Amino acid sequence: LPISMSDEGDSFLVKDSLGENKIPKNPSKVVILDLGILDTFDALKLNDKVVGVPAKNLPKYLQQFKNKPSVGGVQQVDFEAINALKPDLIIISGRQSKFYDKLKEIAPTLFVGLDNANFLSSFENNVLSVAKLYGLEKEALEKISDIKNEIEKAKSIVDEDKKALIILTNSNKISAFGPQSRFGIIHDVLGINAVDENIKVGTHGKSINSEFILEKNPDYIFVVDRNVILGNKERAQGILDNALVAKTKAAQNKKIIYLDPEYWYLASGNGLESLKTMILEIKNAVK
Ligand SMILES: O=C(N[C@@H](CO)C(=O)O)c1cccc(O)c1O
Ligand SMILES: O=C(N[C@@H](CO)C(=O)O)c1cccc(O)c1O
Ligand SMILES: [Fe+3]
Secondary structure, three states, X not given: OOOEEEEOOOEEEEEEOOEEEEEEOOOOOEEEOOHHHHHHHHHOOOHHHEEEEOHHHXXXXXXXXXXXXXXXXXXXXXHXXXXXXXXXXXXXXXXXXXXXXXXXXXXXXXXOOOOOOOHHHHHHHHHHHHHHHOOOHHHHHHHHHHHHHHHHHHHXXXXXXXXXXXXXXXXXXXXXEOOOOOOOHHHHOOOOEEOOOOOOOOOOOEEEOHHHHHHHOOOEEEEEEHHHHOOOOOOHHHHOOOHHHHOOHHHHOOOEEEEOHHHHOOOOOOOOOHHHHHHHHHXXXXX
C-alpha cells in the first residue's frame, strides 16, 4: 500500500498499491495528473521536468503550469496527448486508477494516492518518494517539517468543546463526510471534533437534508461546493439559506465556512504548498 523503492542504480524499482515499475532516476518528461503532486514539483523546483498537466482542471494556484501541454482533465484523461508526449513517467492519484493499465502501456505509472485513514503518513510517503527520484530528500524533509509545524499551530487554537459537520453540495443535494473520509483531515489531523464521529462513508458522502443538520447543530459547518467545479447556478449558499440551517449555531455565529473546492474537491493534499494553504484555511476559520 505505501510506495517503496530500491535503488538499482540508474533507476529505482518502485512498488505501490497499483503495481510495480522501473522508474529512471531524474525523469525529464513527467505527465502529472495529481494536482497536489504537481504543486510539490513546483515546491521542489522540478517545474522543468513536467511535460503534461490536466489543463481542464488547472486551479488558480497552479497557473505557472498553464503553458505546459494538456493531457486533459483529472477525469477526462487524454490518452493520445499523453502518448504523443512520450513521457518517461506518469503520476496519478485515485481518480485515474481506472486507467492504470492503459497508462502503464505508455510509460511507468506511479500511484500517489492519499490514504484517507492515514493521511499524514501517506502524504509524507508520496512527497518523499517523488523527492527520492531526484535526490531531493533533504529539501523535502525540511518542507514536510514546515507542514508539521503549521499543523501544530492550527491544532493549538482548536476549541475542544466545539464540533463540526463537513458537507458537499451538488445540484441541490447535500451529503455529509466525517473522520477518515476524503475531507477527514479537518477531524483526523487538525483535531476539530465531529458532530458525528460515525458517518464513516464513501467518495461522494452520506445523503442528508437540512433537518439532519439542525439535529446535529454544529458549531462549524465546512462546505465543499462541488457545483463550482461544474454546473451552477446552484450554490451552497442558496441551498443552505433555509430556516432549519438558520437556527443552527454555525449559521448564527457565521461559521458556515465555504472551503475553496479547487483545493478540497480537486484534492491537492499532496502539495507541499497547497496542503499548507488548506491548513491555514481551516485555522483561520476557527481561530
Ligand atoms: O464527473 C465526475 N463525477 C461523476 C460522478 O459524480 C459525474 O457524473 O459527475 C467528476 C468530475 C470532475 C471531478 C470529479 O471528482 C468527478 O467525480
Ligand atoms: O473515481 C472517482 N469517482 C468516480 C465515481 O464512481 C468518477 O469517476 O466519477 C473519484 C475518486 C476520488 C475522488 C473523486 O472526487 C472521485 O470523483
Ligand atoms: Fe468527484
